[PDB]
Amino acid sequence: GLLDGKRILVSGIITDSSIAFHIARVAQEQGAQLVLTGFDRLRLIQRITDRLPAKAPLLELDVQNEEHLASLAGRVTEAIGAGNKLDGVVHSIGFMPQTGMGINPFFDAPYADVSKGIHISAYSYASMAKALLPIMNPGGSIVGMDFDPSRAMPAYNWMTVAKSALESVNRFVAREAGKYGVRSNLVAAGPIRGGALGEEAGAQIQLLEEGWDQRAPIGWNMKDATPVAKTVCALLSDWLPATTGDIIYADGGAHTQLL
Template sequence: MLTGKTFLITGVLMESSIAFHVAKIAQEQGAKVILTSFGRTMRITQTIARRLPETAPVIELDVTDQEHLDSLAERLGEHCAQLDGVLHSIGFAPEGAFNFLEAGWEDVSTALHVSAYSLKALAVAALPRMSAGGSVVGLTFDASFAWPVYDWMGVAKAAFESTNRYLARDLGPKGVRCNLVAAGPIRTTAAKSIPGFEQFEESWDSRAPLGWDVGDPVPTARACAALLSDWFPATTGEILHVDGGVHAMGL
């Protein structure tokens, strides 16, 4: 499905990462993948990269560092002539952002910068290498509702989803699609950093018509791989739910 394509994949930290499984599926389907990491996590990502079917190169990218963004296209040239897609699997909020009424702007602005604005920043930075027909795919947690404990991260995800729609508008004429996958809760490193995340784990399976396994990132990863492929040539600005059906249910 992905033979001959090259993808830039962010957010590979552990084998439990959704991004790791997107990279694995992409390679199994014939693609070349390039991973990103930065700072102290570089060594972790380089180690995890060796657990893929084929060891993937890792380049440094902090999406809040404009120098990293400005040089991304040039540095990608060391590994590929062009990109066919980018996976945005980046999110962070300081602990204070998980208290809605008491959070200060410093914590909130960090959450918005890393978890929302970075989608635009990454897409624009990769654009010089993107081929016509390329695809930007991001991971979200349905921002249609005020979830327990999610607080300003939920607001950041709402901004993230809006950013995707504007990117779809502006990158469509350049032949680039922009879509999101709204995943149910997955027990990843990022999820474990959210205070009270176990509330989602305990209730999601019982609410999902298809059931839900918080320890299985593969269904979400498959959806990402499909959106990165050529099988959705006329789909952009979309949010594809992979949550067992919870988004469609009432109380």
Template sequence: MSGLLAGKNILVTGVLMDSSIAFHAARLAQNEGARVVLTGYGRLSLVERIAGRLPKPAPVIELDVTDQHHLDGLAGRIREHLGEDARLDGVVHSIAFAPGDALGGGFLDTRWESVATAVQVSAYSLKSLTMACLPLMERHGGSVVGLDFDATVAWPSYDWMGVAKAALESTSRYLARDLGSSGIRCNLVAAGPVKTMAARSIPGFETFHDVWTDRAPLGWDLSDPEPAARGVVALLSDWFPRTTGEIVHVDGGVHAVGA
């Protein structure tokens, strides 16, 4: 078997539709030789149906990252599909959520409860997920890759999700610091906007189209999740053996240019 991920076992979260970056990361990972396990939350039948569109079968495990019982049992559930002695070589974190009042321009009026939910699901879960998978990774190392959206500036309507993404970026750096001794790398892919189900829940998302149309030096197609998915697969591979705590921008270059 050949490919960037030949012989590796990869866990991919956040596959809800085949338009998602996570779906295409799972697809490309399989094409590059990996065995893939998916997680889903709530609508498992939908995730299983979407999984059927991958090149090869992929089991689906239910995972609510706010449920400690789910997290505590995750390693065991993965072993059920990969074998008792199986190792996990990579984890893709593609999990984010903010209640409606945390998005859309009401930043100053958002309740703490909604902010707490956004931060727990979208940022703290990177730590929760990584620690749940640690028993399958700590003896041999591996790669954790999260999906990000540039948190260095304030975006229209993005509000507390932008704050949560800033927390995600900081969480990734601290995980890189604390897990490096176990050979575990933690990096993020800061993707440009893609028309996914999650994106459609952001009020005013269409404004990002004009920003990327006007400013991306390489151009940007909001309907194409594959460039970001390729970045994820590259970071999962052995081609970045000493890269950790990094944010790789796959956004057509928008982050690098001014207005």
């Protein structure tokens, strides 16, 4: 029971392929009690969440909706019971419009699209922390999902810029979370899975993603989300108690090897 008795909020479950779905599954298997969120279409999200090992309250959260943010802590408290607080929070919501990510030239993304992406992918990490830290226990852990943006790459374009901004936001969130005895960290995952993108972009992406398994000293299996879900659970646990403002790489070691 790695997370026995811990209460964890998990955002970002959209399908049973979502990385958040696997995080939730592994966390329940390890004894956690979960609270889940969804932006919209909650009857649809409930159908997916019913397939987790155990029941979990589902709460509405559109991170661009100020009222949802303002009521969130109260609604969680009602879900988990007065006097109870959260031990963990998982942010697995990243979004960039297609104009900012994919086939579109980098210069052709209008700022309104980039700003929406940054709002959902990076600013919301702070918004969630603001809402939830007042109901988190000392020793608790906020974990966000990242994809290493240290170097530019084809196609990821402004989503890479959004991840760069998330990395910086995480460092500031850690300062605020520290006042509660709470850690804030990101997990930088390898790619988890182009005909839709067309031939050029699809080949470029496939090369990019396959370099990962080539570089990773222990390999990288893009079809298996479990190693990333386990890492997140490690950070949610008591076993990384001195790590905050940081990035943990769940990428097969690929980012440490040039070729």
